Amino acid sequence: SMENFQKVEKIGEGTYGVVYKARNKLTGEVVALKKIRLTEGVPSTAIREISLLKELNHPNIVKLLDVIHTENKLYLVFEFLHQDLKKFMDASALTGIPLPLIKSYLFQLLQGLAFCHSHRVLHRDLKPQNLLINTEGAIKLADFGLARAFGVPVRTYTHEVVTLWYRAPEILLGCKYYSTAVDIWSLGCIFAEMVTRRALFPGDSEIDQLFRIFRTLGTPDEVVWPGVTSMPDYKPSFPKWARQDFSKVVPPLDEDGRSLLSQMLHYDPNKRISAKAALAHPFFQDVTKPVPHL
Amino acid sequence: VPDYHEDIHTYLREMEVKCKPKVGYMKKQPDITNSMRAILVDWLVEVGEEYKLQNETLHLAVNYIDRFLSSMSVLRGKLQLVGTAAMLLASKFEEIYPPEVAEFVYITDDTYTKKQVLRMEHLVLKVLTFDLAAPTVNQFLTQYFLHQQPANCKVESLAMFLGELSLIDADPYLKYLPSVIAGAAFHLALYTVTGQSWPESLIRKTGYTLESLKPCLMDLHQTYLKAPQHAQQSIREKYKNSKYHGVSLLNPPETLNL
Ligand SMILES: NC(=O)c1ccc(Nc2nc(OCC3CCCCC3)c3nc[nH]c3n2)cc1
Ligand SMILES: [Mg+2]
Description:
The structure holds 2 protein chains of 2 kinds. Chain A is an alpha+beta fold. Chain A has 9 helices and 10 strands. Chain A folds into 2 domains: about 1-80, Phosphorylase Kinase, domain 1 (2-Layer Sandwich), CATH 3.30.200.20; about 85-294, Transferase(Phosphotransferase) domain 1 (Transferase(Phosphotransferase), domain 1, Orthogonal Bundle). In chain A, strands 1-2-3-5-4 form a 5-stranded antiparallel β-sheet, with helices on one face. Chain A has a 3-stranded antiparallel β-sheet with strand order 6-8-9. In chain A, strands 7-10 form a two-stranded antiparallel sheet. In chain A, helix 3 packs antiparallel against helix 5 (about 180-195) and helix 5 (about 180-195) packs antiparallel against helix 8 (about 255-265). The longest helix of chain A is centred in the middle third of the chain and has 20 residues, at about 100-120. The two termini of chain A are about 35 Å apart. By secondary structure, chain B is an all-alpha fold. The longest helix of chain B has 19 residues, at about 75-95. At the A-B interface, helix 1 of A face helix 1, helix 4, helix 6 and helix 7 of B. It is classed as kinase. The entry lists the keywords kinase, transferase, serine/threonine-protein kinase, ATP-binding, cell cycle, cell division, mitosis, phosphorylation. It forms a dimeric assembly. Chain A: cell division protein kinase 2.
């Protein structure tokens, strides 16, 4: 089955499995092989990822090329990308990531996210480690092991969801229904982080996360977010911090930027901008596709 | 989130077609019958109740069973194994906490071993080419419900209940798409309970009219009228429960007056 691949080096460990870079001996094509040693049979994370990735075919969604399915092992053959945002931003250490490259990745990521959401998929674990970039200037959503197909309207799904720094206030406050708006929030956080190159809400616990968010955006009340004070994990004792002027939240950002970021980090999931709608934001009027210094 | 409702609806209707089981398959099944399938489905319902599984899970499971059986001929003694593996797959896909494999072995009164359930799971996966995210009558109804004014818990439960019956009988329901059964279901529920019809907004939405749904509506209406007498009864019992507002106890309309 694996005759044609030559392992080259181990890439890392995601939600499940282990990923290796490898090349196809007959074609030349470099691939990421996610290996799943096969208890309880095929893990639901592997079942969702494959079933969902097969449907998601988009230039900004990492592409599943093949599934080599064995009795003891299951292998996912993915298109190979060169690095992750996280690795890149730490490399962008000094330079900083230039606005045009930021705008581009953001535009692309909104594209890949729009497509997921139009295909009833929540990704649920967007964070720089999971966003992969190539040498041509493309960026792509990866690791759909946390993903899930949703229904309309949504019902309750796993509460235990999204890396904490990127996790929406509605998940933190225990809302019984979350939707596509969690992924947009993640992406908001990432946008801020390409800019400042540091995580916008690096909390070490749930209450820590909430408070950091509240310090930045204001403690939400019923006015800014109808329904909040009745949320299972909301507390009347929450300090009431004033909202900051957004220009202070990401100083390098100009008017359109701040505007876009604020709609991505709207508290009220229903008012939070959709990926689709964000594509037409003035922030993007001059969007091109620079290749990054790799 | 109506920001995507229509992208999704359109997609589900493209996908229901690609995900449709072959309408002719039982005729090509040497050893099993519609009747043995209905028994199997009726047991799946029960399993669903016993582990408090989502209705969506049941429907998915069935979908996998029909599609698997569309190319794989199975001996009657093995049909339950297909069904067990399919429910374990549907659970892994759809549920927050899926019942563990042992729980699936157990509910076959150990008709089958762990290893057996798990090699079947692998085989359904291959026959289905991991394509598990199939549209169901459930995903359609749930969209159609958005079109109530005002919403009506009884209608919803009644819709759910009839869509559910439709899983039980391959003849006739294997020749209707999810989207259509759901349509007939919802029209039938709405009418039964409230006297209203398929709203103009769902015509605009789905492009279906009463006229298009008639064929299915006639079948379904008969299934409704005859349900108390069917060989399989698990859905009827399920739908007496307070969670579905006891709608199995609602009397079917005597006529539909189309
Ligand atoms: N930083 C690095 O060193 C690097 C990274 C990633 C990388 N390329 C690549 N990696 C994948 O999984 C990587 C995993 C690792 C752990 C988090 C989830 C993603 C892929 N899955 C599908 N295509 C993939 N391509 C090349 C170099
Ligand atoms: Mg036969």
